[PDB]
Design an enzyme around this catalytic site. Structure first.
Site, PDB file in Angstrom:
ATOM      1  N   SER A 157       6.783  -2.458  11.185  1.00  0.00           N
ATOM      2  CA  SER A 157       7.381  -2.642   9.877  1.00  0.00           C
ATOM      3  C   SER A 157       7.669  -1.354   9.058  1.00  0.00           C
ATOM      4  O   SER A 157       8.597  -1.306   8.241  1.00  0.00           O
ATOM      5  CB  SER A 157       6.449  -3.521   9.070  1.00  0.00           C
ATOM      6  OG  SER A 157       6.880  -3.567   7.746  1.00  0.00           O
ATOM      7  N   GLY A 216       5.652  -6.263  12.537  1.00  0.00           N
ATOM      8  CA  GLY A 216       4.519  -6.924  13.161  1.00  0.00           C
ATOM      9  C   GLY A 216       4.136  -6.418  14.545  1.00  0.00           C
ATOM     10  O   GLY A 216       3.151  -6.844  15.095  1.00  0.00           O
ATOM     11  N   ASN A 244      -0.954  -2.483  13.212  1.00  0.00           N
ATOM     12  CA  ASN A 244      -1.148  -3.927  13.364  1.00  0.00           C
ATOM     13  C   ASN A 244      -2.178  -4.306  14.399  1.00  0.00           C
ATOM     14  O   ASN A 244      -2.468  -5.500  14.565  1.00  0.00           O
ATOM     15  CB  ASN A 244       0.164  -4.591  13.752  1.00  0.00           C
ATOM     16  CG  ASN A 244       1.212  -4.486  12.676  1.00  0.00           C
ATOM     17  OD1 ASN A 244       2.348  -4.061  12.927  1.00  0.00           O
ATOM     18  ND2 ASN A 244       0.846  -4.869  11.478  1.00  0.00           N
ATOM     19  N   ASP A 250       2.711  -6.663  -1.825  1.00  0.00           N
ATOM     20  CA  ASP A 250       1.516  -6.685  -0.979  1.00  0.00           C
ATOM     21  C   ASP A 250       0.662  -5.408  -1.024  1.00  0.00           C
ATOM     22  O   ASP A 250      -0.437  -5.410  -0.511  1.00  0.00           O
ATOM     23  CB  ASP A 250       1.864  -7.053   0.482  1.00  0.00           C
ATOM     24  CG  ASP A 250       2.856  -6.078   1.144  1.00  0.00           C
ATOM     25  OD1 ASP A 250       3.107  -4.964   0.630  1.00  0.00           O
ATOM     26  OD2 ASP A 250       3.381  -6.429   2.221  1.00  0.00           O
ATOM     27  N   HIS A 272       3.434  -2.286   2.145  1.00  0.00           N
ATOM     28  CA  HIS A 272       4.710  -1.858   2.694  1.00  0.00           C
ATOM     29  C   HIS A 272       5.583  -1.204   1.634  1.00  0.00           C
ATOM     30  O   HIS A 272       5.656  -1.683   0.501  1.00  0.00           O
ATOM     31  CB  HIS A 272       5.449  -3.028   3.308  1.00  0.00           C
ATOM     32  CG  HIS A 272       4.695  -3.697   4.410  1.00  0.00           C
ATOM     33  ND1 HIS A 272       3.961  -4.842   4.207  1.00  0.00           N
ATOM     34  CD2 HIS A 272       4.573  -3.395   5.728  1.00  0.00           C
ATOM     35  CE1 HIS A 272       3.399  -5.210   5.347  1.00  0.00           C
ATOM     36  NE2 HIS A 272       3.754  -4.351   6.287  1.00  0.00           N
TER      37      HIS A 272
END
EC number: 3.1.2.2
Length: 179
Positions: free
Chosen positions: A10, A44, A73, A154, A157
């Protein structure tokens, strides 16, 4: 016409934004008719998922350099640091065997994860950079995070607005390596 391949998650694909909005597309624009930037990132992706896609990418894009931005991740999906290390080791090996130069980006996990865990996780990046004698780029999110206006809700990011900055930062890091 010489290609840099970005094998990312990402942070390079763009989280909840288009291909055209993410920093690699902006870097590509900035470097037009000098160096081709091919974004092979997927949100992801674990290191193992990155490695699975790698042989087909190397054959398809025949890159001169591969920027590897993976590992973030891995913990969330049940892979331990030692597994991440070994997966990245394998990635670096495949890149070199395809006669491209690997460029490894340092990854950092949230303080949240644990101090014992973070030291072990973060440590694999300099270890591998030394072991394969390749560039180790710093984790750009260390700087991006200093601007709340550049972070998505969040807190993890970078947002759309951050992407020009990150492209600039990467252009500077990558300048001496790429021409």
């Amino acid at each position: 016409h010489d290609t840099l391949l970005i094998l990312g998650d990402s942070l390079s694909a763009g989280y909840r934004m288009s291909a055209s909005a993410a920093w690699p597309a902006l870097l590509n624009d900035k470097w037009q008719s000098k160096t081709s930037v091919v974004n092979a990132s997927i949100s992801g992706d674990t290191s193992q998922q990155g490695l699975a896609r790698l042989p087909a990418l190397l054959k398809q894009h025949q890159p001169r350099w591969v920027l590897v931005e993976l590992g973030g991740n891995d913990g969330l999906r049940g892979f331990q640091p030692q597994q991440t290390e070994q997966t990245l080791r394998q990635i670096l090996q495949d890149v070199k065997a395809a006669n491209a130069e690997p460029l490894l980006m340092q990854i950092r996990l949230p303080a949240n994860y644990g101090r014992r865990y973070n030291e072990a996780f973060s440590a694999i990046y300099p270890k591998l950079a030394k072991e394969f004698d390749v560039p180790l780029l710093p984790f750009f999110m260390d700087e991006v995070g200093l601007k709340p206006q550049w972070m998505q809700d969040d807190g993890i990011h970078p947002n759309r607005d951050a992407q020009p900055f990150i492209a600039d930062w990467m252009a500077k890091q990558l300048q001496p390596l790429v021409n």
